[PDB]
Amino acid sequence: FVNQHLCASHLVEALYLVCGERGFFYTPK
């Protein structure tokens, strides 16, 4: 699921799945 173009909520979903309990920051600018 990570090795593709990921935009908007789809990007966010990947961050959520990858980062797990570490959490993450999302800064699209």
Place this chain on the structure above:
Amino acid sequence: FVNQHLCASHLVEALYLVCGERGFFYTPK
């Protein structure tokens, strides 16, 4: 050495180091 912007001969060098005896193809178009 791989997680940066790699252009021209610098790209080629990274392919050479990563691919080893598998060899590689370089198609810049």
Place this chain on the structure above:
Amino acid sequence: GIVEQCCTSICSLYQLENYCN
């Protein structure tokens, strides 16, 4: 930033993990 790396171009696990806390 993340959009240039993962949306505009193809994402990777290495790049996503740069945004994990």
Place this chain on the structure above:
Amino acid sequence: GIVEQCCTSICSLYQLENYCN
């Protein structure tokens, strides 16, 4: 192709290995 992925944007091992034989 490889230039768009690795030159114009940041490369990764995953992407380089897509060009290994």
